[PDB]
Design a protein around this ligand. Sequence first.
Ligand SMILES: CCN(CCC(=O)O)C(=O)c1cccs1
Lengths: 237, 300
Amino acid sequence: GAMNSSNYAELFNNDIKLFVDDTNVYRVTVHKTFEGNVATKAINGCIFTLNPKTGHLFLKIIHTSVWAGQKRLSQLAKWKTAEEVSALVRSLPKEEQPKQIIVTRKAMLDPLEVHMLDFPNIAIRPTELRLPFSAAMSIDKLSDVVMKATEPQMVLFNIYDDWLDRISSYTAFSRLTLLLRALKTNEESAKMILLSDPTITIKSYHLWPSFTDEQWITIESQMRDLILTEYGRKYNV
Amino acid sequence: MNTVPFTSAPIEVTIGIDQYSFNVKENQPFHGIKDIPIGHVHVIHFQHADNSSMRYGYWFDCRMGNFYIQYDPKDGLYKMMEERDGAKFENIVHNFKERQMMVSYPKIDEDDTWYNLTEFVQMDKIRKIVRKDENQFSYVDSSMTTVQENELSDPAHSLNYTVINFKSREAIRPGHEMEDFLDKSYYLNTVMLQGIFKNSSNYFGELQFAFLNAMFFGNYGSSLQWHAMIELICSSATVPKHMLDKLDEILYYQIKTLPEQYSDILLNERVWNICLYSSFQKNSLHNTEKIMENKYPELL
Ligand SMILES: CCN(CCC(=O)O)C(=O)c1cccs1
């Protein structure tokens, strides 16, 4: 059934599973036209498909040409997401195919179920978890590859860098969710926290800075402070 | 006109014949139903006074044989049987009629209700949904499950309605996933009409039979099938015009005949609101929309 707090540890067992977030597939800016009407302009998007146990991220870049001449784009985007996730599954060797796909938004359930009919044993699940994956485009290297794309492209990353050499998947997912929640809540402040110390750099092959264990403790505390500070600002608390 | 005699009525029971019904007392001198109109299927149904559990009954067509009802005290129900001795049957009916021990099928001359509810229903198709080839009549009851229900347990006692599943490979062409899920026209016209049912009359006959089993027996799986066959049409952008106009007539008479106090259990809110107000055919069912809005405005 639905993935929630009660069955949280299931995310880090040995049954292969993927989260799918479609929040950045169809991205637009809204603007006025010469005649004073409003129009949208699409920008490149992406599907965020993540194995929470291993950190493997299948970033499918959705180029704006996908939308050319199409109607009802917010609806089409869910079906395009499902088409691409199905194509990814089919491309994987059998022993790498997921046993469950967890969609972050319940409106993806029917499109994915329909595209996955050839895989009756892959469970398609919603979640009651509020997950901050919409902030993936606040990770500079991910945003850069999406914006530079001139055609559809799949790019593979490990969203945990090398953290699993030192921490469990559970802890790595916690850290990722905290960082993304902070980036979603106050992107500028979160980036300042991450990049303020010039002596700590991001490896060419990484997404996040090379913090020591003790530095991660400090960074995580600064991210929690940021989230709490923003809450007090919003609610006047 | 034709007659279904009863050997006797040993237990108190509500007897239905099509949309009519009569209460019979324990050991009352009741010996059958006469003046049954030729040309249509009919249903004779029962609900025991001492146990309203199991409604049950028999679909039949007097053109196919001479049928009678006899209570079985071992199995505890009224059973339909066929009499193969024609002269014996005529002599029984004549004596019962001469003694005025039979109720008359109470059809009004102006009244086309039963024809309207059974226009497309044929005994030969009933006997393929309800499989018991040794009899010319078909038993249905309140508890019989459908093949579709069974998939999700006694196969010989199932209702073999055509399985409709909107999230199945049968309904969705590879490469047309969004198209076929949002517009069921492929599934309706190519898979169901051209392939399985062969024509719209057979489709409508099954839809009508499902409704009648839902209404007369409270058969839940039949209600599911009726709603699915409605939703399949309404969710299709491309439907032949003759089918849309005929569907409006079919549904109008079904909604008209439904008991007012059974609406909560026999009508699915999601399906009816989708079909009348959101679907491709929301504006194609004028008569059904008018009767639904005036008779059951709460559901909507
Ligand atoms: C911070 C961990 N956290 C979720 C936020 C995250 O996904 O990481 C949790 O422990 C729980 C969520 C739901 C039940 S427990």
